[PDB]
């Protein structure tokens, strides 16, 4: 497998070797850097730790500089691990350019969703509003909590709370174009996240 | 609805843990030495960042 991680920019609207539009999301992938390589004999599993976005040193800290110093790079902001990849191909200090991907390949995209805040059950779970006339006093509410006999409410009864902030994949997307000069990927379709938010791109698990 | 049961002194005092108030941002004014909230004019001398006000 493979992958990178990058920053969401925004949406566009693109023509692909024909007049057929493709809506597109822009991911800026300033070249990721390997920092650590984990193996079974020391760490329990094969994996590779990666950093994306350079901090200022005043924002970083000593024990992070010490972790970056092996690869001989600058303090990174977002740090993540990639699993189920070849370790003989990758080394500490290696820079992962966007050239790794080929326009057209199928891809999976993780991101943290836009915070919607403390929301009701209707918006949070698609529940239906009660009637708004005919004497109804039941408009935006989640309904009964359950039967009588348990004398208790069953779990996963869906209610109001924080909507958003969750980690979400989108599978079976497609890479539309690459710009290594600009370090940009164009991905067919919407993806989870606010702008200036982290995204992880990976080769598809299903494909 | 109605309590159905009086709460105990214990259960009261266990609610009252986080009802306490904190007071914060106090430092000393470099001019007069008396204490002021940070990012606030010293009410005694009026100075802020070494300039009368």
């Amino acid at each position: 497998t493979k992958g990178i991680l990058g920053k969401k920019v925004g949406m566009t609207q693109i023509f692909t070797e024909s007049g057929e539009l493709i809506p597109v999301t822009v991911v800026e992938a300033t070249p990721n850097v390997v920092l650590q390589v984990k193996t079974v004999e020391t760490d329990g599993y094969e994996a590779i730790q990666v950093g994306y976005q350079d901090k200022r040193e005043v924002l970083s800290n000593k024990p992070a500089k010490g972790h970056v110093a092996k690869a001989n790079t600058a303090p990174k902001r977002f740090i993540k691990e990639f699993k189920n990849v070849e370790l003989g191909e990758y080394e500490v200090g290696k820079e992962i350019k966007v050239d790794v991907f080929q326009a057209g390949d199928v891809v999976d995209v993780t991101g943290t969703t836009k915070g919607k805040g403390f929301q009701g059950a209707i918006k949070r779970h698609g529940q239906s509003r009660g009637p708004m006339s005919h004497g109804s006093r039941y408009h935006r509410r989640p309904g009964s909590m359950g039967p009588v006999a348990p004398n208790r409410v069953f779990k996963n009864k869906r209610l109001a709370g924080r909507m958003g902030g969750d980690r979400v994949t989108i599978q079976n997307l497609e890479v539309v174009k690459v710009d290594v000069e600009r370090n940009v990927i164009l991905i067919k379709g919407n993806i989870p996240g606010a702008k200036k938010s982290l995204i992880t791109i990976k080769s598809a698990v299903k494909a | 609805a109605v309590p159905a049961r009086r709460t105990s002194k214990a259960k009261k005092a266990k609610r009252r843990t986080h009802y306490k108030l904190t007071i914060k941002g106090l430092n000393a004014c470099s001019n007069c030495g008396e204490m002021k909230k940070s990012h606030h004019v010293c009410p005694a001398c009026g100075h802020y960042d070494g300039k009368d006000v």
Partner: protein
């Protein structure tokens, strides 16, 4: 976005206009946090017009200002009655002709007694 100040749209517009007029008059004012943080941008966008000086800007500012009386800078008896508009266009534009912004500063002060309202002083220069 922008603040609301517990007032309706018209009410907050009128309160901003009144406070900005009073501020242009007095060159210094006591307010709360939020009112000040909005009046900041407001007065600075008025002094921009003051610097531009054209009649177009004069009318864009008369759209906003309450036509209060800033000062009777008298010489003989009562002649020189000066409005806040005249003050904006003949004292303050010439004052901040050279700054590229930053026509006010905010100073946090004692909270108010009756509310614990955090109080603030805005001042030119």
């Amino acid at each position: 976005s922008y603040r609301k100040l517990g007032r309706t749209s018209s009410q907050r517009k009128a309160m901003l206009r009144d406070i900005t007029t009073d501020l242009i008059i007095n060159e210094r004012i006591v307010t709360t946090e939020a009112r000040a943080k909005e009046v900041r941008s407001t007065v600075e966008k008025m002094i921009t017009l003051g610097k531009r000086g054209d009649l177009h800007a004069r009318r864009q500012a008369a759209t906003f200002v309450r036509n209060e009386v800033a000062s009777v800078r008298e010489e003989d008896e009562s002649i020189v009655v000066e409005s806040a508009l005249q003050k904006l266009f003949n004292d303050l534009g010439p004052r901040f002709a050279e700054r590229q912004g930053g026509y006010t500063r905010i100073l946090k002060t004692e909270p108010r007694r009756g509310d614990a309202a955090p109080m603030v002083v805005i001042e030119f220069v």
